[PDB]
Design an enzyme around this catalytic site. Structure first.
Site, PDB file in Angstrom:
ATOM      1  NE  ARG A   1      37.626  42.327  38.534  1.00 42.71           N
ATOM      2  CZ  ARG A   1      38.160  42.374  39.273  1.00 42.71           C
ATOM      3  NH1 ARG A   1      38.537  43.428  40.118  1.00 42.71           N
ATOM      4  NH2 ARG A   1      40.016  41.751  39.428  1.00 42.71           N
TER       5      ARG A   1
ATOM      6  CD  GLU B   1      52.357  22.419  29.174  1.00 44.32           C
ATOM      7  OE1 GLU B   1      52.057  21.237  29.989  1.00 44.32           O
ATOM      8  OE2 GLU B   1      51.796  23.906  30.240  1.00 44.32           O
TER       9      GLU B   1
ATOM     10  CE  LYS C   1      42.096  43.230  46.663  1.00 42.65           C
ATOM     11  NZ  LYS C   1      43.089  42.009  46.278  1.00 42.65           N
TER      12      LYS C   1
ATOM     13  CG  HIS D   1      41.915  30.415  39.407  1.00 41.53           C
ATOM     14  ND1 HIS D   1      42.729  31.641  39.488  1.00 41.53           N
ATOM     15  CD2 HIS D   1      43.354  29.734  38.437  1.00 41.53           C
ATOM     16  CE1 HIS D   1      43.260  31.316  37.668  1.00 41.53           C
ATOM     17  NE2 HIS D   1      43.983  29.918  37.767  1.00 41.53           N
TER      18      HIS D   1
END
Ligand SMILES: *[C@@H]1O[C@H](CO)[C@@H](O)[C@H](O)[C@H]1NC(C)=O
Ligand SMILES: *[C@@H]1O[C@H](CO)[C@@H](O)[C@H](O)[C@H]1NC(C)=O
Ligand SMILES: *[C@@H]1O[C@H](CO)[C@@H](O)[C@H](O)[C@H]1NC(C)=O
Ligand SMILES: *[C@@H]1O[C@H](CO)[C@@H](O)[C@H](O)[C@H]1NC(C)=O
Ligand SMILES: *[C@@H]1O[C@H](CO)[C@@H](O)[C@H](O)[C@H]1NC(C)=O
Ligand SMILES: *[C@@H]1O[C@H](CO)[C@@H](O)[C@H](O)[C@H]1NC(C)=O
Lengths: 595, 97
Positions: free
Chosen positions: A151, A357, A463, A487
């Site tokens: 990070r 799937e 958080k 994402h």
């Protein structure tokens, strides 16, 4: 003669032309994915450029047709979706800069490699090695170093990118008569012009809040249970009253908690329900595994798949000579062609992945009658949710015994189910606070309420209250930690994962009660119930033609978000969690006492 | 007719009329190539807005579904008029006794 018949004829032209162009791009993408070659890439590029250009010219033509006088629900849905500008509402330079911003941060994350210092000879990329360094390792320092280093490097190189990304995305939405880019993502669930079933774009946040207020009480006992479980692994690094360290989640962001199944196993001596050894012993190849799924799909009522799937779908790795994408992907090429790209192995997960799937593709034949632009789910959550119940039903011990995988004399006691229940809770209930929290931070920062210098501390504070995970160390504005997610670094909506969770469980109870089941939710095997599949097919056949609120009420009877099904399945676990949490502290505190 | 009327690159030799101002009469052929008038504005021979070519070419390929594979159709129409029936069926011959 009127504008409406012009749009109908114009849509008729678009529907036939698009399907062939979409198929060629889809065929090019299929060839490129299953055969990574230089000619295959440029074929997808040329087809993709033509497909993008075709959508561009079609959108311009449809913008001349007003939406106010369109009288039936079907036509207005296609024209509203096709008239979407996307990034073209601004100037070319503004659009190109955003696309360049979209392109570069995709490359930075994809090629983002963080390695140990002092040995630059070779470095470990994020995908192959950094995945195993937090999902199997038991070292606090090694996990902490990997958490901080990734990070630190990625956040600094994404913070200027995320500064312009949020502003530019807000510009595109505001220029499109949207409050923010968050409202643009909330517009998928918008239902307008339909009485009773009407849904507002901004109504999603409070409705998600309504269902989330009941998720926390179940999550709090789960939080206390894992913290007690984590006490054995880490006695002093995690305070009994504080939150969990961010690098002890078993994953990078804490989305999936399945990596702590071994650490937080309730009964390690009790065997699981896995019967993987049965497949290799009886020589159940992936070809026959899909036959077993096909035999399962016809038992519930869904029609058997066409013969074209067999000669067009590759369910085994081609080998070293040919490079194929191993990612689990279902392919709806159009024009009656359906394929699944499978690097299937002889494992229980691949059997469940296959069932997951086929549920995507089985959904595709359902809306084949609808027009190409409406050949989609009602909302983003339906497509994945309908495939999840297939895996949930196929994972039941009764299903395994029915097809001979599990021995009929196997003992299904309460001890072997709670661990099975806990693992599902780790994967499903674990991501629920995280999915809402980052997204709620995402809409709010899109709204601009969050000060530009107050993202992370506000994120970290959430958080503390929502997920109950404490940070390793406070982070300033130099790093951009939130953008590290796969994402968000590709402009992908994340609330869809939350909706599909409720949809999966909402569908199950309605499907189970239609099957006339006298047992609990975890024992529901929807097999050999053709009437249940017909009622399931009612929503499947609608697709995007009908609103999701209308589609939901067709099966479950409730057009809005429903949290009741989730509590029912975990009720044996919810009561059991109360049993072993008497000594532990239910809930958590915002203090940073652990670390 | 997949083995004959389909190519891997696509058999575009077959076309169908997507648009027409009126439905066809029984046993009527329409081979007109005039640009369809979808809007009130005149086409002026230009396939622009609300003006498109009525004929579309089928992209038949051997990798399609059962419902999209090409199917050769032979249609037999039988008529009886005052003119003599000159189309007969075969007659069986039995050995002479
Ligand atoms: C994959 O691509 C290579 C290179 O173009 C080609 O030689 C090979 O035949 C392809 N394989 C298939 C199955 O199309
Ligand atoms: C409304 O018009 C569209 C135009 O294609 C049609 O598909 C739909 O069936 C119509 N609905 C009703 C109720 O007539
Ligand atoms: C798309 O952009 C055009 C021009 O930039 C504009 O006239 C149109 O209203 C936009 N679409 C929407 C839905 O606002
Ligand atoms: C699907 O089922 C139908 C009806 O039982 C049958 O006629 C057809 O051959 C089957 N197709 C396949 C590929 O099994
Ligand atoms: C299973 O049920 C038996 C009988 O009530 C009980 O004694 C036992 O504690 C239960 N075990 C679990 C794990 O729930
Ligand atoms: C469902 O049907 C299949 C095939 O007819 C059969 O093998 C299976 O045993 C049935 N399920 C049950 C629970 O009997």
């Amino acid at each position: 003669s009127t504008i409406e018949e012009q749009a109908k004829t114009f849509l008729d032209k678009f529907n036939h032309e698009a399907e062939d162009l979409f198929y060629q791009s889809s065929l090019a993408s299929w060839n490129y994915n299953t055969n990574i070659t230089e000619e295959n890439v440029q074929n997808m590029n040329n087809a993709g450029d033509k497909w993008s250009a075709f959508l561009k010219e079609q959108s311009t033509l449809a913008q001349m047709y007003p939406l106010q006088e369109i009288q039936n629900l079907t036509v207005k849905l296609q024209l509203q979706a096709l008239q979407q500008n996307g990034s073209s509402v601004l100037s070319e330079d503004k659009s190109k800069r955003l696309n360049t911003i979209l392109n570069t941060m995709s490359t930075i994350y994809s090629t983002g490699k963080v390695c140990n210092p002092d040995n630059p000879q070779e470095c470990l990329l994020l995908e192959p090695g950094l995945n195993e360094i937090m999902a199997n390792s038991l070292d606090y320092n090694e996990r902490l170093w990997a958490w901080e280093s990734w990070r630190s490097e990625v956040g600094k190189q994404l913070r200027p990118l995320y500064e312009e990304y949020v502003v530019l995305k807000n510009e595109m939405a505001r220029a499109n008569h949207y409050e923010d880019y968050g409202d643009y993502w909330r517009g998928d669930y918008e239902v307008n012009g339909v009485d009773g079933y009407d849904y507002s774009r901004g109504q999603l946040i409070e409705d998600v809040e309504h269902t989330f207020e009941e998720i926390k009480p179940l999550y709090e006992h789960l939080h206390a249970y894992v913290r007690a479980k984590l006490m054995n692994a880490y006695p002093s690094y995690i305070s009994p009253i504080g939150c969990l360290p961010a690098h002890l989640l078993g994953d990078m962001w804490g989305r999936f908690w399945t990596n702590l199944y071994s650490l937080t196993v309730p009964f390690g001596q009790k065997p699981n329900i896995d019967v993987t050894d049965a497949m290799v012993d009886q020589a159940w190849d992936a070809q026959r595994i899909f036959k077993e799924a096909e035999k399962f799909f016809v038992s519930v009522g869904l029609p058997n798949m066409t013969q074209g799937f067999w000669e067009n779908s590759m369910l085994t790795d081609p080998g070293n000579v040919q490079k194929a994408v191993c990612h689990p992907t279902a392919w709806d090429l159009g024009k009656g062609d359906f394929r699944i790209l499978m690097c299937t192995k002889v494992t229980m997960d691949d059997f469940l992945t296959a069932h997951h799937e086929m549920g995507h593709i089985q959904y595709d034949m359902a809306y084949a009658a609808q027009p190409f632009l409406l050949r989609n789910g009602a909302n983003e959550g339906f497509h994945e949710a309908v495939g999840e119940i297939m895996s949930l039903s196929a994972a039941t011990p009764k299903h395994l015994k029915s097809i001979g995988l599990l021995s009929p004399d196997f003992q299904e006691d309460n001890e072997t189910e709670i661990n099975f229940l806990l693992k599902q809770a780790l994967t499903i209930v674990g991501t629920l606070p995280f999915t809402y929290m980052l997204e709620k931070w995402r809409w709010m920062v899109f709204k601009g309420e969050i000060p530009k210098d107050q993202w992370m501390k506000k994120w970290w504070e959430m958080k503390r209250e929502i997920v109950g995970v404490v940070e390793p160390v406070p982070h300033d504005e130099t790093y951009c930690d939130p953008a590290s997610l796969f994402h968000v670094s590709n402009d992908y909506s994340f609330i869809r994962y939350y909706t599909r969770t409720l949809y999966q469980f909402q569908f199950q109870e309605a499907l189970c009660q239609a099957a006339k089941h006298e047992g609990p939710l975890h024992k529901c095997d929807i097999s050999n119930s053709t009437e249940a599949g017909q009622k399931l097919f009612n929503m499947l056949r609608l697709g995007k033609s009908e609103p999701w609120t209308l589609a939901l009420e067709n099966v479950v009877g409730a057009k809005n978000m429903n949290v009741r099904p989730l509590l029912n399945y975990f009720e044996p676990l919810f009561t059991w969690l109360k049993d072993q949490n008497k000594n532990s502290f239910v809930g958590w505190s915002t203090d940073w006492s652990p670390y | 007719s997949n083995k004959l009327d389909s190519k891997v690159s696509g058999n575009y030799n077959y076309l169908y009329r997507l648009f027409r101002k009126s439905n066809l009469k029984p046993f009527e052929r329409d081979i007109s190539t005039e640009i369809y008038q979808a809007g009130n504005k005149p086409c002026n021979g230009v396939a622009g807005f609300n003006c498109y070519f009525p004929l579309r070419s089928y992209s038949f390929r051997p990798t399609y579904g059962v419902g999209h594979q090409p199917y050769r159709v032979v249609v037999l129409s039988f008529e009886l008029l005052h003119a003599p029936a000159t189309v007969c069926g075969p007659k069986k011959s039995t050995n002479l006794v």
